[PDB]
Structures are given as C-alpha cells and as structure tokens.
Design a protein around this nucleic acid. Structure first.
Lengths: 91, 104, 99, 82, 95, 107, 80, 99
DNA sequence: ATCAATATCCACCTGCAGATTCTACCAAAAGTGTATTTGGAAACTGCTCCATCAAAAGGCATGTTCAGCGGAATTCCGCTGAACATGCCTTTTGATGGAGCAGTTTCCAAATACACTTTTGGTAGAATCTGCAGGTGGATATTGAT
DNA sequence: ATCAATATCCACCTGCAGATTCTACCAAAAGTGTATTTGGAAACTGCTCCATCAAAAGGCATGTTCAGCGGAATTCCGCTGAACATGCCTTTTGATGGAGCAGTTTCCAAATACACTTTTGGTAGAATCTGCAGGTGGATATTGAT
C-alpha cells in the first residue's frame, strides 16, 4: 500500500509536464506518512487531554495548528475546512 | 460516489479513514476527521511538489529527484522548519560557504 | 615554473563541488564492514537487507556533514578557519550529547 | 573475522564530508576524532535497530529496523520506506 | 467533585521502604508524580509502536520489556528488566 | 479476603491502576495480563532509585524532608538518571555547583 | 515603561550568574530579552491553543505543560 | 575606610550564591505582565491560573539559565571570559533555533 | 608580612506554614465468577534476497616532498564593564467581589456494527517508451606569476 | 596590468537503465444500507480562585571611577594543503545455493465482555504536630591595601 498514485495526481496538477523518480516518490511517500502520524498524534493527545473519546475534524484542526508553521497552517486549515464543508453539503 | 469526490479531493478519504482506526488514536473517529486530514495531507504534498517541480525546472530537468525535494524544502522557511529534523536521503545540502573563507 | 594553486584554492573548489552534488562519500563496502563489525561485536549471527546498510550510511553522512557545519561555525567563532577537535567537541557539547 | 574496520573511514572520505559541510581547513587531529564520533553514532543507531530486530524474532536487520531506530533517536530518515 | 488521581500514595509507600525516616515536601511529591507519569507515557508509547510495527494487537510484558530496553540507560535498563521480570514471575506463581 | 494483583506481584504500585490506564491510553487494542504488572514493577523501581538518591541528598544537607533541590541534585549527579531525564526540568531544583576553571582567581 | 523592559538588568544578571557567568557585555540584556520574548511567544501560543481547543478563557497550568512538552521542554511539578 | 573588591570577586561570590539557591530570579509581577502581554496577541480577555504563570516562569528561567551555560562556553572557546551577543547567537544556532 | 573590612560559617533558637494523623462518607475502582471470542503461536512451505565466491580494471587511497600561511604566543593600549554607595518606585503582600471552571442532567445527532454489493489500486509481468548520465570538444572563466 | 595554465561551463549527442504502459486478476477496500448505542454539546448552577484596589516592603536605577579585558599588531614556526607517484582494493557484473522471511491453515491459551460485590483512594475539615528558615552571636576565613 502507498500514496504514490495520489502524489502523482497532485503532481500532475502543479506541474503537468513533470515526472518524479521512484527514489523521490519514495521520499514523498515517507513525507506523507510522517505528517499523518504527527497530526494523528497531536490529535490523539488533544482528544484525550480532554476526556474525549473521539477525534473529530476539530481535533485534527487544532493539531494542524499545533504542528505546522504559520503560513502553512493558515493554508492547511483553509483547505481542510473547505473540504469538510464540501463533504458535508453533499448526500 | 467515493468520499473523496464527495469532499473535492485527490487524496483517499476512505484509506486515511481506515488508517486513523488502525492507528488506534482514539476509541472513535468522526467522519469529519479523515476528510480534513486527507485535505491537509494533499495540501502539503501539493506545496512541496509545486516547489520541487520548480527546482527541477531551474536545473534543466524534467524529472524530480531527491535533490529537488531537498532544494525545495531547505529553501522554504516553513517546510524547512516542519522538516527540520528530517533527512531526505540522496539530497545533498544547500550550496553555502562562510565568508571569512573566501579569497581576499 | 610548474603551475601551483595557492593553499585553499582547491579546498574551496571542493566545497563547491561537493556541495553541488549528492553521492555518498564514504566507500560503500568499507562502511558496510564497519556496520557488520559494530553490529556483531553487539549481537552475533545478524543479517542485513542491503537497504538497511544503505539507510545507516545515508543517516551517518547526513549527521557527519551536518556536524562539520557546526564545527566549522565553532572554529570561525574562535577566529580560525581550521576546524579542530575541540570545535567538534564544543558543538556536540552544545548540541546535548554531552554537555 | 572483523577488526579495525573503523580505519575504513579514510582521511579522503572524512575530508569530502567536511567539504560538503563547508569546511576549508582541517587539523590533522580531526580524523581520529571523527571516527570516534562516528563509531558512537553507529553503535547508538544499531543497538536500537537490532533491538527492533530481536523483538520481532528475526535474524535479519531490515531497513525499517533502522528507520525506526533513527526515528527513536530523533534523526528521521526519508527514502527507505519511512 | 471529580477525584484527581496521582501516585503520591505509592510514592510515599516506596519512599518509606527506602528511607523510613525521611519525608518529602509537597512540591517534591508533585515532581515525583510528574516523573512517574512521564515514564509511564514513555514506556507505554514505545510499547504501542512496537506492537504496530509487528502488526500485533496486544501490548504484553514482552513489549514493556523491549520498550524498557530502548528507553533506559544501561544499568537502569538492566534492573528495570530484573524487577520487571520478578514481578511477573511472582504474580504468576500465586492463586 | 480477595487479594490485589499488586500484592500478588508483590509490589507497592497499583498493578490494577496501571492496567486501567494502559487500556484507556489508547495504546493498543488489547493488553496482556502481565504488562500491567511488569510496567508497574518498572515504575516502582525507578521510583525507588530516585528517592534513595534524593534521600541521601537530604542527609548530606542535614535535612530530613526531601524537596525539589534534593531530587535535582540526585538526578544530575547520576550519569544514568540525568541522561534519562535530560530533556526534563524539575521545578525549583536550581543547578549543580559549577564554575569554569578559567573563571577562577589566579592563585 | 514597556513590559519586556520590565525584565530588568539585575535579573538577567542574576540568571547569568546562575549559569556560572562572570563577565557580561552590556549588549547582552537587550539580546537576552528578545530570546525570552521568542521563548514565551512559542510556548504560550501552544498553551493558548490548547486552551481554546477546550473552550476556556483561562490558560491552565496543564495547558502550559502540554505546551512545554511539545516544545520538548518537559516540566515536572505542575501535573505536567 | 576604602574597601573595594576587585572586578570579578563579587561576580564570583554571586555565582557561588545563586548556584546554591533555587528561587526564581525574575520578579513575578513584571513577568506576569510580560506573559499576559505576549498572550494577549494570541487570544483576548484571557485569564491565567496562578500555576500556569508560575510554571511558565519556572520554565523560562531554566531555559535562560542553561542558555547562559552554553553561551559562557561559547565565550570561553573564543578565549574570552565575557559573554557576548554573538556567543548567544552561536549557541542558539548550534541548538537548532537560528539564522 | 601586617592590620583592617568583610564575608562566611556554625551552633543555637523558635514560630509556623505546611506536613501529619483522625474520622469518615462513597462513587469509582478493582476484584470475582461466567460465557464468549479471538490473537497470533505452531507447523508446513513457497520464494525472495542475502552471503558468497569470481575476475577484471580503474578510481582511488596512500605516502612523500615542500613551502605558505594560519594558529599560537607575546605585547599593549584604551574602552567598557564591575564595584559602590545613593534615592524611592515598583513589587509584594494581603483582603474581596464575581466570572468562570467544573458537576449534573438531558437527548439528538452522529458513531458503532454487521451485511451485502461493488469498485479499485496493488502487482505479477511482458512490452514499449524516454529522460539523461556520461562522453566530447570547443567557448568562457578564474587563478596565479610577473 | 597582460598572460599562460587550467578548471568550468554548456549545449549537442546517444545507448540505457529506470519510468511509463497496458492487459489481466481480485482480495481487499470502500460504499450502500438499515439497525442499535451513545458521546458530548448545551443549558443551569455553585463555588472556587482569579483580577483587582490598598498598603507595607525592599529592590533597582543611577553616575563615578578605574582595572582589567579584548582585540589589534607583530612575529616565529610548525603543520596542512597541493601535486605527484604507485598500485591496492573497491566497484561492477554474475551467478549460485540456501536461510530465513513471510504466507496459510489450524486451533487453544488468553483476552474481552457483561454482571455481581467488595473495598479503596480521594476529598473535606478538624486538630494536633514538626522541620526548618531565618535571626542572633561570635568565631575565623577571605580579600585587598599597604
């Protein structure tokens, strides 16, 4: 299992004519997983420093803030909220 | 329809959702969670490939290799900080020589 | 008569070179034996995926290189351009490895 | 029989690493010091690494063994499956 | 009013088993408590990781042990394992 | 006349509590019976190591109540503990007595 | 007065002393304050973020502790 | 009448003294003020448990006191006995916080 | 060497703040006994990938010569931090309304859970493609001598 | 400065290893869809414990003076960098045997999951109790001047 096809879609969106060597995709793959565990981790803690049994979108979001630098977070929050709202406003 | 299309995303909402559960981070995972985290995840890979991609371009290259990822990261204050304790194999270092060291 | 570059011209030339590339710099095989030596005078009858030796090596060079930058910074702090043992040592002290 | 392999880390190799690191001048005494410092770095990464191996009841150190070891030490590697 | 658990009563027990005539300031006790929670967290955390690496569902003494080996300095690790094992052996041999 | 696991493992620490926390800790899906016990044994033990050292500390101060300074001196003066707690700060502990020789009066 | 200047020279002097320093360049104090400012900005930001996550208006000892722990400056004596 | 200790004697006396004790050395209220002010840029109308300020204070001094030990080392490496801005700068660089 | 100013240390003293011993009410643990479920050891084994040996060649490590320059030691201003005694402004301490942090209670949206149905993203694998690594020779630096 | 020695640059060229390209299979995913459970938002509340206004306290700001430190200059010389020779060992390309990782079906010690019952650790409130911090005195060690 891996994020490679997904990295690849995204990749084609920013740089339509650019490719990625496996060695890079490999690093890309590592990168995604790392970020994932960090976010998930801060979420884990957050949730239970509050005697909450659930990690919701709200924990992920505080986590994104606790973990990312300034502009990147201003931007992740944005995309994240955007997605949730779109996911919800459907079905 | 997949939950990603429902969420406007290229990263796998359902896979991330599965992953959150096996990571056993909490007794339960609301549906909003994997959606949001798959966004942030896709958002960040977008930023680093956007910047890697140019490094490859600045080097008369078409295929991104680790060196471009490294260039991309170390040359951006935020990614460089987010990634401050991370080693990107085969990446090299940024060209940088202290002044006192140059000819006179 | 024979051409002769002044001490340091080549050195700067090598920084430019090496900093411009990313191949490993420690002999491959030599390093592997060190790995097998340290590992074994630690637990016998062990084995290695070649990638595990390779990860050890990428990790090491990246540590060592990152260490020399700090060392280089320490020497300069002392108004020198030549790194010395105590520089490496001050850097690891401040880094926590000692202290 | 393995012995003195620390001497495989040759002057030239240790000099290139210093160059990548931006260093123009090196004292004669740096090399022995560097091998000292590398030997410790290796022992630290490998003790853990092999501890992961044993745990898992395998005879072969996997790269993940190393990848986990490096992550325990706060020296996260990317490119080998994590 | 929701309780507020802490190891203080055990710390104190253990204390007296070691220095029966010594007492511990309150602020001291609070540190010992933080010390325990931290260690707890650290060992459990490593243990968790260990299980996930090995696609295992259960954290056992096995994990606590490897975890301790990874978390503690040599000798400390050594005793910690000794004690560790004493405890499980004794607990088993008993009705 | 039920007996507690802590008494069975023969320990002062809450073998049951540790077990409780381990489950609530979201660390794993399941928790072996012996981990709670082992881990408890390990906690207790480290506890004993610091109070013993910290206790001496107080003797050496002609004091009988252990305060933070006593735990801080106990720690940073033990290679192993100090390493283990090397990214930890003990409130109210101060720092070990120490002056770079070069800063001393020329005798 | 300004608050950061509220951290005075004699206090910075006392700190230094505790760190075993004997002679102190005059330009240190200002340089020091900026380091303390940046220190507290980093911690507080995370503590206060924890605060909000819990919907409160009081930074709690714990919220500082959780913060120091993320910053990697684990503190003992206040729960965390 | 005339006494006067020579430069360094009282400094020394003070080091001995302060390495003995453990009280905080920054005055509470100004500190409390500084904290409150910094925080006021993060969220408004905040209140702070007395413990949270006390924990934060306790954490900053231990930080600064330690940064003082690496600075002092950096100054001595430069064969000085007077710490300087650059000395702090160099320690924070090797520590991983710097520019 | 000699006082002279001071700091430091030590034995003793005692009030008190904080540590201790008491009594006890109790929901949350923690232990017990039963019933059900399942993680992951053990035994057989398909199969990958690790250790190994094999041979050749050339990229490198080694070892030397040699002299340039950088590190170390010494001298020496002059400026800048330390000591100090001086004057009083802020910090500290302490008594007090009120704003929340918490304890409880309610119920509806949202999360499990198990059952099917369906779509996808790994992959074994032969086939086809393509960026560029590595070679080249000729145009522009860049160095170092004079 | 003009100038020979050399390293550096950079676009043109091409066999090649590593990337892209279906074709096919399919277990595991991810989705659809009722059915059951429940977590935590949400509102009301009470009681801490926090921000605040006053007053007793005890540093910090301040300006002077000078000692000693840092750094500029200067110099001796020893070690490090550059260039060169020789030839060893790493690198490269294969191929082979087999160890040990990893897939699978199997089956039970150990785990979970109610439910009944015993009890223990935390809170609160009072009353009693004590280690020590600071406060004195007086001896003596340290520092600095002569």
């Amino acid at each position: 299992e891996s994020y490679a096809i997904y990295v690849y879609k995204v990749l084609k969106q920013v740089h339509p004519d650019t490719g990625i060597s496996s060695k890079a995709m490999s690093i890309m793959n590592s990168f995604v997983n790392d970020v994932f565990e960090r976010i998930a981790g801060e979420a884990s803690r957050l949730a239970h420093y509050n005697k909450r049994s659930t990690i919701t979108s709200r924990e992920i979001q505080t986590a994104v803030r606790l973990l990312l630098p300034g502009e990147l977070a201003k931007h992740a929050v944005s995309e994240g909220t955007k997605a949730v709202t779109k996911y919800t406003s459907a079905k | 329809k997949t939950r990603s299309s429902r969420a406007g995303l290229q990263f796998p909402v359902g896979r991330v959702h599965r992953l959150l559960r096996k990571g056993n981070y909490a007794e339960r995972v609301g549906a909003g969670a994997p959606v949001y985290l798959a966004a942030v995840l896709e958002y960040l890979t977008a930023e680093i490939l956007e910047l890697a991609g140019n490094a490859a371009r600045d080097n008369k290259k078409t295929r991104i290799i680790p060196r471009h990822l490294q260039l991309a990261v170390r040359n951006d204050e935020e990614l460089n900080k987010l990634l401050g304790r991370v080693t990107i194999a085969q990446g090299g270092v940024l060209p940088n020589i202290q002044s006192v060291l140059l000819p006179k | 008569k024979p051409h002769r570059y002044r001490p340091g011209t080549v050195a700067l030339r090598e920084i430019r070179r090496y900093q411009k590339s990313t191949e490993l710099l420690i002999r491959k095989l030599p390093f592997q034996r060190l790995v097998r030596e340290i590992a074994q005078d630690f637990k016998t009858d062990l084995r290695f995926q070649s990638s595990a030796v390779m990860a050890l090596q990428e990790a090491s060079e990246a540590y060592l290189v990152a260490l020399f930058e700090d060392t280089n910074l320490c020497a300069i702090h002392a108004k020198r351009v030549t790194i010395m043992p105590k520089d490496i040592q001050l850097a690891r002290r401040i880094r926590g490895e000692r202290a | 029989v393995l012995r003195d392999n620390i001497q495989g880390i040759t002057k030239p190799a240790i000099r290139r690493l210093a160059r990548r690191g931006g260093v123009k001048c090196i004292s004669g005494l740096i090399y022995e010091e560097t091998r000292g410092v590398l030997k410790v770095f290796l022992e630290n990464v490998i003790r853990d690494a092999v501890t992961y191996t044993e745990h898992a009841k395998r005879k072969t150190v996997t790269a993940m063994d190393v990848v986990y070891a490096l992550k325990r030490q706060g020296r996260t590697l990317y490119g080998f499956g994590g």
